[PDB]
Every structure is written in C-alpha cells, then in structure tokens.
A paper describes a structure:
During translation, a conserved GTPase elongation factor—EF-G in bacteria or eEF2 in eukaryotes—translocates tRNA and mRNA through the ribosome. After peptide bond formation, the pre-translocation ribosome contains peptidyl-tRNA in the A (aminoacyl-tRNA) site and deacyl-tRNA in the P (peptidyl-tRNA) site, which must be translocated with their mRNA codons to the P and E (exit) sites, respectively. Using time-resolved cryo-EM, we visualized GTP-catalyzed translocation without inhibitors, capturing elusive structures of ribosome•EF-G intermediates at near-atomic resolution.
The pre-translocation substrates, obtained without EF-G, feature three conformations of the ribosome and tRNAs: non-rotated Structure I and rotated Structures II-A and II-B. Structure II-B features a rotated ribosome with an A/P* and P/E hybrid-state tRNAs, whose acceptor arms are shifted to the P and E sites on the large subunit, respectively. The elbow of A/P* tRNA is shifted by ~25 Å toward the P site relative to the canonical A/P tRNA observed in most studies with different tRNAs. Structure III reveals EF-G bound to a fully rotated ribosome with A/P* tRNA, similar to pre-translocation Structure II-B captured prior to EF-G binding.
Residue numbers in the entry:
A (entry chain D): 1 to 46
B (entry chain b): 1 to 271
RNA sequence: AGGACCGAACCGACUAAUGUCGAAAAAUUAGCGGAUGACUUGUGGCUGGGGGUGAAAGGCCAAUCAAACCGGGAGAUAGCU
RNA sequence: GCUCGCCGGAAGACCAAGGGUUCCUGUCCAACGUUAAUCGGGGCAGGGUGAGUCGACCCCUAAGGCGAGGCCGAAAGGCGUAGUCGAUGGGAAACAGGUUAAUAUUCCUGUACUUGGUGUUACUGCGAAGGGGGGACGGAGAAGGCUAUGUUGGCCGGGCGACGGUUGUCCCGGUUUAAGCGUGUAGGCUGGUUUUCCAGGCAAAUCCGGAAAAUCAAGGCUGAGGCGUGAUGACGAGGCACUACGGUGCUGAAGCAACAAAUGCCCUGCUUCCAGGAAAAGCCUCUAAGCAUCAGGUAACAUCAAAUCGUACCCCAAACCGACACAGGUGGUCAGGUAGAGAAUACCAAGGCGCUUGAGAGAACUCGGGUGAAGGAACUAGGCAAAAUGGUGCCGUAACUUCGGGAGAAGGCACGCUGAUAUGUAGGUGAGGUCCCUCGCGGAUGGAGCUGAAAUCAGUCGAAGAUACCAGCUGGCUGCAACUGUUUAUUAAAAACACAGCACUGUGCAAACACGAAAGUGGACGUAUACGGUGUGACGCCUGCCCGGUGCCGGAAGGUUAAU
RNA sequence: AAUUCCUUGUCGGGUAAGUUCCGACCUGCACGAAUGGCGUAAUGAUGGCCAGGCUGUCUCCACCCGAGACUCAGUGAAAUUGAACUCGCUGUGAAGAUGCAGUGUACCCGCGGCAAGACGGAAAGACCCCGUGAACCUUUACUAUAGCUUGACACUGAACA
RNA sequence: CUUUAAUGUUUGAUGUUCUAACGUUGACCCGUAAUCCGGGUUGCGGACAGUGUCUGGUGGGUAGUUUGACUGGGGCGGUC
C-alpha cells in the first residue's frame, strides 16, 4: 500500500535545501554543526 | 417568489427557492469586478480563528459604492444583478455623464427609475442625501456612522432604519435590533428599505446546501471528549455544567459588550 | 430537475474463507457500499508539540500520539529486580 | 524453428513524477539471480542521447513566500507597504516519409512556418510604469453538422486448394497519404455607417463610455469538416538479385465509392439553472511629458539571428515507493473486430508473455473447486457459508403514504433458427436526372444504390432457445436513527458524529469572538433577514409544575471590606 | 421498554414444544416532554423475530478435479536450547516427577502421522495488590496564575454649578 | 444632648461647558506611478477612553502537587 515516502525533488529542496536553511537563524545554526563533524553530503542536494 | 418544491427525492422535499424574474441572467459588468479569496477562516498567523468557515463556491467581488460621491448628477438604473457577497440585490446604475457604478437596490426600485445624490434631490426611494435634510420620521438605509466614511447600518436584505429625532447636532436612529443610537447629523443615508425582502424565507432542505455556501459542520460541545471542550466527558449523554464557550466563557446569557468609548452615542440596548 | 435509480472505471471496506516465522509490519480471493456530488484525484502552498487539525474516535500529525521526533540537562531518580 | 497456452480499456503502446546508464554491443560466470546457466537489469571494455518550432530557460501572474524603508517586540525576532519571487495556469512558430546494433517532430529528403535584429525602399506623427478594449472563464442538459475510424462493395495482385466438394453469388492480402497554402461552407454572435457635443476613464486623448441627430438596412467577427494544391511525389502488396544466409540492394499494381460512427471536433458555442462561477502579461487602440530637421510608425524587399539546458532507458514496474528481481502503491494520453445498451463480460487482432526450481507419485490431512440418492435448517449463538434468484418486451400489482413513493412490490406469458408478409418491410441515407441561380461548398425536386429494426404468420430441431460468460432471493411484524453522507489508517461503520429545521443568547462595527506580549490579521472588503456561541435534530402533534439551590441578569435600604 | 431488579411476571397470539418475538395489562425497583415526549411515509452492508423458495449447514458422509503434503535432484531457513545413556504405574516431595523410592515393562535406529505431556514456544501478567512510582482527566481538594474586573496615583487641563 | 434649617469650613461623590494633552481602523493633500507608515490641513471625540505601577474580587482558562496505615488479598466497616 501507499508508503510514507513519496519523493518529489522540487519539494525536497524547498524545505531541506541550502537556501531553505540559510534563510533562517536556526537553519544556519544547523550548518555550523554540520560542518563541525565534517559531513560530506552537507545538505541534501542533487 | 417563495416557491416550495416537489419531493421527487430525499432532501429536495423541504427546499424553498426564491426565484426572482427581476434579476438579470447574463454575465455581470466586467471592470467593476475583482478577485476575492476565501481564506478558509484563518488569519495571517495561519491558525483557524473562526470555526465552521471554509469550502463553498468560488465567487467574485462586485465593487459597490457606499459613499455616493456623485452629488447632483442624475442617474438611471440599468438592471439588477445577483451578488454572492451581499444578502441584498445590487443594481447597476449609469450616470448622466457616463460612469457606471453599483448600489444596493431599494424596495420599489425596478430598472427604469431615476435617482441622484445631493442636497436638492427629492425625498424619493433611492436617493442619498445628508441626514440633516431628511425629514424626521423617515425610513432610510445605508447609514454612515462617520461623515463620508461608509454607509454601514441597514445593509442586509429587507432592513431599514427609522429616523426619530433631531436635537441640533445629532439624530436618533431606531435601529433594526430595537436599539436607539445617536449619530452625527452630517452623515448620508439612502431612502427606502433595501430590496430582496424575501431572503429570510430560504430554507435549504439538504445538508450539502449549507456546504456550498461555505459553512462547514459544527460539532456540539457535548459530543467531544473533555480535553477538547469544557462540556465534554460523559459515559453517555452527560452535561452537568453551566453552558460555556469552547474557551470557558458562559454562552447562555452573559453581556460581553465592554466599550465605554461609544456608550455616549446610544440610548437603549437590546430590550 | 435530482446530496434521484441500476451499473463498470474510480473512491470505499460490511461478511466469510485464506494467510499469521505471510506474497504483504493489514494483503489476496468470492461477494459488498457510494458512483453529477457534503464526490474523487494531480502538482504546489498553509497550520506544529501543551501546539496543530478534527462531519468528534481521544482519532490523526512520516509503520511512533491521553501530549511527536532528534539533541541536550543527564550517568534524572529507582526504599525495586 | 514448429506447434500449444494466457492477457488484449491490458499482462499492449506512449509520457509526466521518480530513478540514474539499468539502453546497445563485444566479453567473462567467482559473488549476485532463492536451482542450473553458455543467459542476464551481474562483473568488465567500448559505444550510445544531435532541436529557431517538443520541453525547460523565458515574458506573465494565483494560492502563498521573502520583504528597502516602516509599525512592533527584553534579545533573537514578528507583521507588512513599494516591490520582488512562486505553475499545477495564460503567451510566437513543423509536418510527412526515410535512416542506426543504440536517437529523432532533433539527423537526412521533400514541403512549410514564427518573432526579432540589420539594411534599403515607400510613406507617415511617433511616444509611456498611464487610459480602455481584449485576454477572460461555472454546473447541467439537449442536440445538429462532422472526423478519427470501422464494415461492405468496387479495384488490384495472388490462389483454385494434403480428405468429400470448390473458376465462382469462391478464398487471401492491399486499397495509405500530413503540416501548410488557397477556398469561407454547416452553423454561432451582432443592426451597421458618417458628423457634432459632453462635468466619466486620479493628466491628456481622435480610443472607451454617454447624449442625441441623419443615413442604409446590411456589414463585420468566429467557425469543425469538405474540396483544391501539397503530391503526375512519397509510400505500397508482390517480384527481382543477392544473403556475413542477419538482412540488403533493385524495380514495384490498385490506391476508389457506399454506409455506420464516437465520450473526439465545431463548442471557450446553444438552451437552462442557481451554489453566480481566477489574475497579470503577450495582443489591439488612445494619448502624457518628450522629440517633433531627425528619431520612430507600418508596407515592401534582401540578408542576419533564434543562445543555454534537457533528449538514452524503465515508467502501473524486476529500474519508481514498499529492507527483496516482494501477489502491494502510483497521475495523464491512445483505445481495433464479433456478439453486447456498454470502456462490463467471453473469444480474438496489433502487440506481448507463459509468471527463475524442476521430475515423479496419485496415502491421510489442508486449501480451491465440481457432483450427489432420500430428507430440506433437524445445523448453529444466529440459515455464517453455500445453493438459489438474475435479461428484455407486454400484462399484472397490497397495507400504507409526506400523494413523490411503496414498486423491478408479489406474480404471470413470450424468446432458437428458417420462410412468407417484404427477391430484407417501417425508417435512415442519398446518386444520376430534372427546375431555379442573386450564377454556389447554392436551393427545389427526384428517387438509383447502400443500410435496415421490429412485428405478425407458417414451419422446424432439442430434454432444455434470456441457453455460455454476464445477471435482484422475496414477503410479513417490530426496535432505533428521518434521509445521502461521516468516523476509530491497522480487531468496533453503528443507534455514534453530522444534517436541514427549531430555540435560547451574545454582538450597533475600531462588533462580539479567536490568533498573537504587541503591531496587526481572521470575523468580513460582511452590518442584525448579519455574525458568534450553545442545546436539540426532517416532518406531524405538542412542549406540563418548580426560581429555594447553582449560574446569568437587574437593583439599591443596610451590613461588611483593599491599596491609600 | 435499548429503561423491569424481583422474572422466563400475568394474559392473548405464534410453535408438538418459544428464557427470544408480536399484542395488551400497570405492580414505572429506577420512563417522561428541546440532556426533548409520543408518533412517522420513504431510506439502512442497522438490531430482533417469522414465512416461502433454496440448498451437503445437517442427519452421515461418498466420489471426482486441480494446488501443497509424499519420493528424487538443486539450493537451503527459522523461532528455541544448563547438560541428557529423554519408559508406564502407585507413592513421596517447594504439596500435579522422563530423573527420588518401590515396582512393572522394554532389542538398536529410522520413516509417515496425530497432538495428551514436557506446568511446550512467544511476550520481566495487562487482572490483583504493593511503590510515600508516572502520566493525563475532573472538581465548590490546596497553593498559585493568564485572563476579565474594581479602586488609588500617574500620562492629565481649565471653567462652572 | 435627641433633633433638625441656615451659615462657615473640611473631606469626597456626580453632572455641564470649553480644548490645548491624548484617540481617530472620518475626509482631503504630500512623501509616491503605494489601501503600510510618516508628515500636513480640517472634522468628530476629549480630559473620557486606553496604558503603566499598586490593590480587592473572579478565575479548572492554565500549571505544580496532595489524596495515610493496620488489615487473614484489597475495598467497604472498625480502629490508631
């Protein structure tokens, strides 16, 4: 039956992209901690 | 025409339709229209600040003239158009110089009548003129509260307002709710009661006929569980409290007017 | 004309059998209900945790809901095992 | 390769979403494939996606997002004006044939088209974020004219047939052709035409609107299909040569008419209903300041430009979502024949597959079925489950009723084929001919040809003629809820929720009320025939007594009492 | 009676037989008028009840068709498990014994079955109680508090009774 | 003294007029091709409203917690 993950690559980037984080204060606070442990795929992109 | 229906199906049995042959079947006048969203009964914050609102049929706003700026220019009524916003019928009116506007339609105003605004206009149903020239003891509508702001009182269909007394600067208006308030005498008002007097006789028959008006179902407070409503609870049909709102303010008689800023303008309340 | 009637697509889930380390963390099979409407569906928006939304069951909110999920107070406390 | 079998409104064919090389070819079989494997969506090496017209990008905006200033907030921040983003929407243009192992409306052949730039020529007032027109719109129904397309005939080739017959009222195949350009039809909408004036369109206006006067009764707009050209081309069965025996090369006939017919097109029409059915640009027209020598405006002709990205492949699945090559999930388009009302169902075409373990045996038992003597609910918590009923036409129908219903109530009779009626009728279709012509895609008449129900009668076969698949069990009495609906995704679909209707009550607008420290939004661009809250629940009859208690409302004689 | 405990009340009908059903009686433990009363045509995957037709539901099962089971080949799990040379009975025992005592019986080992036992497997019982454990919900429990409201001073001035 | 009417005075309570604080989610003008907002004229209100500090009342709207033990299982009963 219909599972809980229907992907839509426009909809993924608008709410977990790069500029979706950088537009808010707490979103930039994520990428400070994402860089600290050295995440390779730093956000979800491509 | 208060026309009861034939019961060829359930739901159709109790319907009454107010068919009016006076209305115009055609499409409305275009450049006086604009868009109008529905908003679902939610504010800019996003939370639902008014329950049961939503759904309904898509409708377009008709720009209507309440202020009646054109003083002295005579005007002729073209037709009558259904408006899904008002409960009253509106009329497309063409002026002597060329402008087309909308007005709220009075009672005995068929298409083919002559109206104007201004102080020298005759006291005949349809004209609008400042309140200090209207004779005491006359029925008006579209009453402004502040001079040249609006036209606010007596706008829903079949209503009117009785001018009673003039003490120099103010004038007393026995409102539709049995309330006598005073207003500034410089305001304008339009003679005659508003048309479509049989709007009250619409009964809707079925359940979906209130949905496409935009009114969602309401759930009684005694139906819910007591985390939701302050009635709630129950091991089967228990009320046991005094009837309050969903936010715990008593609903079966509790005077909630608290202004003290417009109390100087009234005489009586709801009796 | 109709929240009209019979009936596929479509939407739904009343019954029985099967399955229960399944084909499947809810399905198949034989029927069954709605099927021009308060229908259903696509893509995109909006509303968030004592808050949301709710034709109201305390249901649903990413297989989690009488107060989500992740990190932190935190090695909480544990007269108990 | 030969048979056999299954799907065939899919188990076919295209796409979007989403994947990411899975596509093709050569190559190897450790792992992976629930078995083997020479095979593969596996490993490995190479190859493969070509655009002025498709799509994105782009110009335009909806919901909504960000938001210079600004308003507000201990802080972070919240809201929002100017704006500026955001498609699922609106906006310029291409089709047919061919070609690869893999791509194509992208390459090639042929035929077109669109908006720009640049030039020259011809003439002229051009000119905005501004005005206006346009763009630009619902639901339902009825048609009518058509096409896609099918079937038959004609025609063209090919056959005369493994066993009885078959040169004919015989059998098999084919009979295809676009965009464009030219024509303006079926039909739809609208009275045109020139001149004067005006306080309306935040300025101006020759445009829009308005007021008339005269003039003619027509003009204009939209418009499927048809027919022409496109195209004496292209394709084309079938032959010819070669075949690495894969397929390639080469010539290559007919290419018409009739009828049927869409849910597609005309139609964003038309009638009609109320629940009253987006915006902005491209487009067209008007002018402002401004330039009016020029510039710019259209028309003509020549040339130039149309960049960038995506393009393979799967796409109802072994490639996407479900941990799996999982009996699950997933939006749109195309939709042939025979019977059928039908996209149901059954059998088939195009096309695609036989579901990645088989071979034996024919015990109990279990699952899925088929049949059954006599009995027919005796079973059981209970007719659960099965069996049964099932189509169409006519006849026939009860209590009750809100006069619609009940009702397909219940129940009956007739259904096959053949012939006659009638070398196939009623009906539809419509050629030749003839008459009009304002002379056309005309009208009138004409009836060939084609198509063709259904009914009656006469036979006639079988046990059974709605034969298969497909397809209501019915009645009676009562409980509850008026009704269709909604609900516990995953043990509860109900009498629960809703509901129209009724009542009490709040609210006079800067409304009550809700979200928010606030600004401000919703309520509502509404105004008491309105909005909010509550309780009951269609409709009919009605809705009794009690105001001490508790709340609400009103009152003021007195008691009592906060900071101060 | 969706309400009636006593109760299967009493009477009438229905059946050979009716704790259900229909109709009344009133003795209403403990119905009752918008937390609505009594009706009510139509509607319902609604509850109860009866009838016709129909039948493997049954008396009582029989046969047949396929799919597993079964044999062979290929791959190849799982939950559970202190160790086991893992018999019946009477008794005894932390009180229901494969394991102790007495006694009986029993060649060693497969295969197909069935499911009485191994207090079989699964899930640190959900019932019950305990904890000076938790969460929610209610209220005239207690203390608070947003909110709404009263008054004093401030922003805040003149006149006049 | 009990009473009362007038005077004088002190403490407050109302009510009426004014406008210059303040309100304006009235109109119009400008910032500006802008329904925010600021500025300007005018009108209507007007020392009210509204807000701050303090204070009485209300307050399951919301929150933190309490709700004993013995007991022939617990509850109820009875007891400490």
């Amino acid at each position: 039956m219909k599972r809980t993950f229907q992907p839509s690559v426009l909809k993924r980037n608008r709410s977990h992209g790069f500029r979706a984080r950088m537009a808010t204060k707490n979103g930039r606070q994520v990428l400070a901690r994402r860089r600290a442990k050295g995440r390779a795929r730093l956000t979800v992109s491509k | 025409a208060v026309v009861k229906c034939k019961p060829t199906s359930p739901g159709r049995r109790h319907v009454v339709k107010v068919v009016n042959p006076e209305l115009h079947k055609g499409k409305p006048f275009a450049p006086l229209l604009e868009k109008n969203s529905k908003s679902g009964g939610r504010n800019n914050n996003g939370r639902i600040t008014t329950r049961h609102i939503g759904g309904g049929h898509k409708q377009a706003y008709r720009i209507v003239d309440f202020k009646r700026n054109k003083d002295g220019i005579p005007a002729v009524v073209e037709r009558l158009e259904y408006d899904p916003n008002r409960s009253a019928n509106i009329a497309l009116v063409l002026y002597k110089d060329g402008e087309r506007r909308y007005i709220l339609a009075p009672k005995g105003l068929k298409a083919g009548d002559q109206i104007q605004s201004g102080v020298d206009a005759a006291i005949k149903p349809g004209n609008t003129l400042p309140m200090r020239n209207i004779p005491v003891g006359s029925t008006v509508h579209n009453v402004e509260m502040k001079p040249g702001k609006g036209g606010q009182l007596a706008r829903s269909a079949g209503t009117y307002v009785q001018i009673v007394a003039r003490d120099g600067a103010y004038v007393t208006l026995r409102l539709r709710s049995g309330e006598m308030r005073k207003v500034e005498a410089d305001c304008r008002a339009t003679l005659g009661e508003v048309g479509n007097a049989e709007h009250m006789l619409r009964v809707l028959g079925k359940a979906g006929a209130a949905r496409w008006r935009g009114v969602r179902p309401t759930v009684r407070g005694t139906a819910m569980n007591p985390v939701d409503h302050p009635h709630g609870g129950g091991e089967g049909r228990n009320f046991g409290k005094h009837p309050v709102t969903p936010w715990g303010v008593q609903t079966k008689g509790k005077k909630t007017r608290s202004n003290k800023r417009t109390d100087k303008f009234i005489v009586r309340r709801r009796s």
